[PDB]
Design a protein around this ligand. Structure first.
Ligand SMILES: NC(=O)C1=CN([C@@H]2O[C@H](COP(=O)(O)OP(=O)(O)OC[C@H]3O[C@@H](n4cnc5c(N)ncnc54)[C@H](OP(=O)(O)O)[C@@H]3O)[C@@H](O)[C@H]2O)C=CC1
Ligand SMILES: NC(=O)C1=CN([C@@H]2O[C@H](COP(=O)(O)OP(=O)(O)OC[C@H]3O[C@@H](n4cnc5c(N)ncnc54)[C@H](OP(=O)(O)O)[C@@H]3O)[C@@H](O)[C@H]2O)C=CC1
Lengths: 117, 117
């Protein structure tokens, strides 16, 4: 979240790094926009740092109903200044750092009462 | 074929054109390496000049047997200085300009007798 890490610091550091001669191409998803065979043919080496960008579901009955959303997706829409819906009462399921970030961002986003399960 | 069009002329003209500020990216097949949705998102317009790059088959019995090859593929392997096999006797089926180019390139490539059907 923004209150813990300022994005201006991150942007300034990446600008410092790209001054060194590293080219960053945004909005390019490998396998969906550009093949991996293309990168394999055109480059002397390939490194995959894709990360873990899926959210585990509730693993319960009715987990597919409307009104249930993952924590990672929620934080991504918060970051991109998109249009979200929260409501007065929000229940966050989990106990790691994702749950803490979701709960505190929800408290900042006008949720009147937030409870962690 | 090279004896009718010199490739040095074509290369010099394309160099003249690319001096004007046009970037040409080689070895990039759209739909196989780069998606068309990528170009649709990243560019203000897209023009498709892909051409007709398939050869019609013989439409006869045994057309899939080894030893039968298309004219376009044959001319492409001649151009790329690849390793081909012809033999003493070659039969070219067709009557257009593709047949003429194939027959004359075959006469230059050591075929002792070439016949056009
Ligand atoms: N990379 C990071 O920053 C770290 C991740 N986290 C937390 O862990 C998550 C992912 O890492 P990892 O620890 O491997 O993930 P886990 O699969 O271990 O899940 C982590 C959290 O969810 C609980 N949990 C998992 N499955 C269920 C289920 N069916 N029902 C109820 N609770 C469940 C765990 O509690 P329990 O203690 O009982 O296992 C814990 O609170 C993050 O989303 C975050 O919440 C926390 C610290 C470091
Ligand atoms: N772009 C170019 O440069 C032009 C193309 N060509 C010729 O035409 C071809 C492609 O253009 P297009 O004319 O539309 O192609 P076509 O499908 O009309 O075929 C052209 C040639 O093949 C003959 N042919 C077609 N199908 C069969 C079959 N089953 N059996 C035997 N002969 C057949 C035609 O003779 P028929 O006279 O009886 O139709 C003609 O010689 C080229 O490969 C080339 O050979 C020639 C001039 C211009």
């Amino acid at each position: 979240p923004q209150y813990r890490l300022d994005k201006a610091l991150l942007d300034a550091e990446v600008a410092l790094m790209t001054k060194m001669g590293i080219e960053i191409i945004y909005n390019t998803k490998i396998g969906d926009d550009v093949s991996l065979d293309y990168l394999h043919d055109n480059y002397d080496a390939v490194f995959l740092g894709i990360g873990s960008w899926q959210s585990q579901g509730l693993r319960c009955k009715g987990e597919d109903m409307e009104g249930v959303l993952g924590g990672i997706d929620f934080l991504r829409e918060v970051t991109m200044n998109s249009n979200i819906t929260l409501g007065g009462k929000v229940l966050v399921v989990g106990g790691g750092n994702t749950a803490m970030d979701v709960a505190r961002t929800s408290k900042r986003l006008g949720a009147e009462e937030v409870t962690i399960i």
